[PDB]
Amino acid sequence: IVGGSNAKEGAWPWVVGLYYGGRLLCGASLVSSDWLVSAAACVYGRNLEPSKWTAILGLHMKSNLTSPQTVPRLIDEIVINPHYNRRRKDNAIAMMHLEFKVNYTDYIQPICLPEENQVFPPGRNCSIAGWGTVVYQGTTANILQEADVPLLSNERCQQQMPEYNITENMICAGYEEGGIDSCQGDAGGPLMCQENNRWFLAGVTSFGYKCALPNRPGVYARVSRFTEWIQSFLH
Amino acid sequence: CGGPFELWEPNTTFSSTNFPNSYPNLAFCVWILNAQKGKNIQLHFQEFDLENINDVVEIRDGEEADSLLLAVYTGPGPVKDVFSTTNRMTVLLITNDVLARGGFKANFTTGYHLGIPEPCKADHFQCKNGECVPLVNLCDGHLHCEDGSDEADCVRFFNGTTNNNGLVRFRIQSIWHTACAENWTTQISNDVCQLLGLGSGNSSKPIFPTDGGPFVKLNTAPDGHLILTPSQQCLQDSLIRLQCNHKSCGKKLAAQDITPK
Ligand SMILES: *[C@@H]1O[C@H](CO)[C@@H](O)[C@H](O)[C@H]1NC(C)=O
Ligand SMILES: *[C@@H]1O[C@H](CO)[C@@H](O)[C@H](O)[C@H]1NC(C)=O
Ligand SMILES: *[C@@H]1O[C@H](CO)[C@@H](O)[C@H](O)[C@H]1NC(C)=O
Ligand SMILES: *[C@@H]1O[C@H](CO)[C@@H](O)[C@H](O)[C@H]1NC(C)=O
Ligand SMILES: *[C@@H]1O[C@H](CO)[C@@H](O)[C@H](O)[C@H]1NC(C)=O
Ligand SMILES: *[C@@H]1O[C@H](CO)[C@@H](O)[C@H](O)[C@H]1NC(C)=O
Ligand SMILES: *[C@@H]1O[C@H](CO)[C@@H](O)[C@H](O)[C@H]1NC(C)=O
Ligand SMILES: *[C@@H]1O[C@H](CO)[C@@H](O)[C@H](O)[C@H]1NC(C)=O
Ligand SMILES: *[C@@H]1O[C@H](CO)[C@@H](O)[C@H](O)[C@H]1NC(C)=O
């Protein structure tokens, strides 16, 4: 996210950052007490050594890490989606198992998965989270930047994104005139869309052609087509 | 970009492009290892030493346009073997343009059920890790099979179209069946809610006895685990139409304020 605002501490407890050997690479959305969900575009080629990965749960400010709300955890298993394809950029999701269980604290809460036969209508105002990068050719922000991003249709996204074959398993979301879109360093950011006083997981930040560009939105992985696949690992 | 291609049964041992020297950068090779119908593929590696995440081997199992994935190997070390399912194991190599490594080798000998251990028949339940447990851990409350398949979900719903609704369909060890609500309380209600991965019981009430299956008698005890007994002695049985709400999902639990600015 480029044009994001500072989020209140605790407003998004199900948004964590994945550290790869002491360095933040991509974000993940905690779904269960032991299984996370992140974009497969970052764990691709790194799942062989799960001990190197480490996920900080309930993290809000990287500099303010000494707070007891941040519970560190170690990764021991990474499961990439079988239908993944790095060239076509299709089904870029991958779950990550935790070593030990974690208690649901005030700043750590699980996210809700989208049920089957439940389509999100386009033009729906609902924001995202994650360590968004403020400037394309620069560095990210220490605070959890966030901003509202409306949902678009697949046909309009295909008309605006002819470089990539937009299939049914992908959903786009971005401003028509650009300015505020997900950028580098925030792959795997959840597309949290509120439904009946409850937030769901309506998309995972897969990739982006050019962030903060007009008519160039970001393509997100449609999680509603992988509900049972994710639920098969939650137990 | 123009290396080897599909092989067959006799030709087994092959390097990527050049074993004694390093592979050229920006190369995208492919080795579509095939076999006869009904035969699986094996991809044991005798030598493997590649670069970091920038250089990987996207081992595919497509056989069609909808390709699957089996393993993504990279870096040095004796990587584990790959055991495909179909008779067409596609091997795609993706390399960077900096610090090219030597290469690797692969000896693919086809066969039947390679890698996957042979399941034991004659009343031997095989959990998803290959271990065999005939009746010692058939959904009884133990974790012998470390993958959790021995204590897997032996419970489900019936005519429960939505997520957290349905009947009280219960499987003791082998056969699925309903239960009874003669001693049904909110305690066992929230217990079976949690066992089904749900929240708390909202409103539990029966409708009518539908089938005469071997219903189970649910009971309560301070030992934690629920007492069950599939006795077929119950007149006008009350099939539980469980209405359990969802668990604590992604709702704001903190004490946030209202500052719309
Ligand atoms: C967080 O920041 C506050 C003030 O900026 C500081 O006093 C505190 O030591 C920091 N770390 C915590 C609370 O763990
Ligand atoms: C979680 O709660 C349990 C009791 O339910 C307690 O024993 C444990 O210390 C708590 N914290 C963790 C990290 O498990
Ligand atoms: C969505 O939010 C933007 C600003 O965040 C606002 O301009 C727009 O009117 C909103 N749309 C709806 C339907 O609420
Ligand atoms: C996308 O893929 C489908 C399936 O092969 C194909 O029919 C279609 O022409 C492709 N579209 C583009 C724009 O590549
Ligand atoms: C095996 O390799 C040889 C040598 O290039 C080639 O002539 C032959 O067609 C290959 N396939 C076989 C023998 O099935
Ligand atoms: C392939 O060759 C290696 C070389 O030692 C041998 O160990 C192996 O049994 C052969 N067959 C395979 C890997 O199926
Ligand atoms: C469930 O629906 C099926 C529809 O074929 C019906 O036959 C059956 O009697 C129903 N059972 C209950 C308990 O409603
Ligand atoms: C179950 O209910 C019946 C009828 O009220 C009663 O006689 C019996 O003692 C109850 N059993 C238990 C274990 O509560
Ligand atoms: C039961 O469901 C109703 C739906 O209208 C809801 O209002 C109520 O809060 C629920 N009660 C519990 C205990 O979940």
Residue numbers in the entry:
A (entry chain B): 785 to 1019
B (entry chain A): 524 to 784
What did the authors write?
Human enteropeptidase (hEP), also known as enterokinase, is an essential enzyme in food digestion and is localized at the brush border of the duodenal and jejunal mucosa. Activated hEP can stimulate the conversion of trypsinogen to trypsin via cleavage of a specific trypsinogen activation peptide, namely Asp-Asp-Asp-Asp-Lys (DDDDK), which is highly conserved in vertebrates. The functions of these domains and motifs may be involved in protein anchoring, macromolecular substrate recognition and inhibitor specificity. The light chain is homologous to trypsin-like serine proteinases with a typical Asp-His-Ser (D-H-S) catalytic triad responsible for peptidase activity.
We mutated all three residues to Ala (namely hEPmut) and observed the abolished proteolytic activity even in the active state. Notably, native gel analysis showed a reduced shift of the mutated hEP core (hEPmut-core) compared to the wild-type hEP core (hEPwt-core) upon activation, likely caused by a change in charge. However, the active hEPmut alone can generate a normal hEP map, showing an overall shape equivalent to that of the active hEPwt with a well-organized catalytic pocket.
